[PDB]
Design a protein around this ligand. Sequence first.
Ligand SMILES: *[C@@H](C(=O)O)[C@H](O)C(=O)N[C@@H](CC(C)C)C(=O)NCCCCNC(N)=[NH2+]
Length: 212
Amino acid sequence: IPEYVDWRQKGAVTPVKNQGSCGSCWAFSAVVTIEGIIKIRTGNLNEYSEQELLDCDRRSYGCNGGYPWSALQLVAQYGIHYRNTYPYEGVQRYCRSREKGPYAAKTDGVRQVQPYNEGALLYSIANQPVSVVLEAAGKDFQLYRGGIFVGPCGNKVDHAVAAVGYGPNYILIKNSWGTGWGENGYIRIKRGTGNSYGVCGLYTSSFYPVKN
Ligand SMILES: *[C@@H](C(=O)O)[C@H](O)C(=O)N[C@@H](CC(C)C)C(=O)NCCCCNC(N)=[NH2+]
């Protein structure tokens, strides 16, 4: 696999979003990976609905948190609507998938990256954007402005984001805190430290969609 990956340069990443106060990171994270694999497989970059996952993933807890895995499983079982059809409201409401017509996109399954394994995660990122989790509660992460982030941070993961690239010393992360945070909404997190957890627990739980 190459020394640099950046799915933005391939036209596979939509603009940075702001989840707001709602605990919907898990849905934002999943949607990044759907937007990416549909571009890779079909050639078209579309925005898909975080709100649909927020409302409709019965295994998750709406704005009280959730699971990227079960959100990705939902898209493989049923599908997902365009963001324009089902825009983001920042609050969980009733599932409205059936009222909004046929699904826009569908995937075929979900896979987990082998946890606590840096190379396995890089391999997956070389193939497509990946849903990953990290510990975002620390002030250092909250206040991040730029550069390759080394912490300080623990491994008590609490925030789902998306890995959309990497380089020799970092993994490139699309966050859902708006374009004013970090590097126009992104953070480069240090890699190669030899800690099996990853910096900020980044290797704890990573999933990606499968699309034939
Ligand atoms: C993430 C965010 O919006 O910043 C959000 O808090 C979240 O989904 N957290 C997850 C954990 C990360 C993905 C590692 C979470 O807590 N998931 C479990 C379900 C939510 C907690 N339980 C209940 N009953 N609400």
